[model samples]
Target chain A: VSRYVPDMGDLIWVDFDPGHRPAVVLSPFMYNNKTGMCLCVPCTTQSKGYPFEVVLSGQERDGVALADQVKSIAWRARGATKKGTVAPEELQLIKAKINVLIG
Target chain B: IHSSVKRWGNSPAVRIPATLMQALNLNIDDEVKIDLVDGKLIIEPVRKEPVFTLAELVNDITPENLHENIDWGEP
Candidate 1:
């Protein structure tokens, strides 16, 4: 009888969870709608918000931690769920930020 | 390759394209080991979508040339 059904390690695209504590930890929108966000652990609810907001720990790279090895997970999700191809300008911004974090 | 998670449908499932399964010598039943290498989530049978062709869609709407030959002032 839980709303949180996603696997513990699976990635997800969270719409915007406000009912949970620390509102705005997961914004209404973010990059990669396919793999909307990475899930650190699991939780459940029926708050009439989004399909679900990926669960994450307070201390993660927003949602890009340990993403290099798992680009498929994140990238595939991004690609599959994307309505159109990733915009060039948006791609540039993502790469720049990722470079700072990983490089 | 037909395999199932311990409790399939209980969690988010990553779907692999058909071709990828063949290329990796994997079947639906095979168990895959997934992990985060660097920042990417790598899967054994993972493959990217292939781009086949690009066809542009166009529509042409031009005035008819027959109107000019009718001779507006003539019988």
Candidate 2:
């Protein structure tokens, strides 16, 4: 019983502890079947350091994507709302940053 | 406070001092993540998630983990 089936590059508001914030889906849509588990990279408004942050342009709100804060969140664990989607170009840049962080 | 980076095949590797390892509670065969930030290397241990027992999984529902309150102002 999944509420939302998030696709890769989809930006959703995740109800993380303390408060709800935005995060991007890293795994492909329905990659690991219909388990409701997905890999996501959390984003923050605060931009710190270099080569580790990717700033989103032309977005409704200024957001900096954090590459190192990747986590696997269960859909049932948080209240997820589809806020927006990352542009293809920006998604590619984010994927590259994730590679640098993980690899 | 300093460790030398040695050549391991084509890649360079640095040995973690025993004292530092003890301080960080790291053991052999443990996994670590290496990242480069601001032209500096940052190494961090990979944290493993706790294996959920059936009781823990069944009792996982909580207010903090779920959204029970809502505020839709001026909508």
Candidate 3:
């Protein structure tokens, strides 16, 4: 298991055993170390029937940001891979939408 | 009812009648999309994106929204 440092705003791939899924790091760089514990919002290819779904580019296949399914996970060794980053403006909107979801 | 187009600097504008505005459910400063289709003007109300509140989403946590049974095959 190789250590991959996770940073806020970074899009990474995570392994849940059978397959990998895309996730966006939402925590600051404070916890970004070999521990691999950080906050992230999972991304999915399902982009229908949701207004909060933010479509992202730069990946092999476009993904929709799932602002609702945010969590803190301790990633496994080599469990995360760099996919892409989100634009600042889009991140801001996503943050607001997620805040509304939290409240 | 008929009215003359008034000059607003470089562009000509027509005042929308109260009846038309009421029928269209338009308010002052409300945004609308205008299109020129087949030499006719078409005005449509701009729909704001729907925001889902936490209550509305979590209130129902059945298999439909929460999770769906997937077959992983024989392990």
Global lDDT scores for all candidate models: 0.29, 0.64, 0.65
Cα lDDT of model 1 by residue, B1-75, tens digit: 453345446775656565665566764333455877898666764343212111210111123211111111111
lDDT of 2 at B13: 88
What 10-residue stretch in candidate 3 chain A is worst by lDDT? A87-96
1 or 3, which is superior by TM-score?
Answer: 3
Give the winner by TM-score: 3
Query: lDDT score of model 3?
Result: 0.65
Runs in model 3 deviating more than 4 A are A76-78, B1-75
lDDT of 3 by residue, B2-37 (tens): 766799899987787756775666643344778878
Computed on C-alpha atoms, the DockQ of candidate 3 is 0.04
**Pairwise DockQ winner, candidates 2 and 3:** 3
For model 1, report DockQ.
0.01
RMSD of each: 21.9, 16.8, 16.0
Poorest 10 consecutive residues by lDDT, candidate 1 chain A? A19-28
Residue A29 C-alpha lDDT in model 3:
53
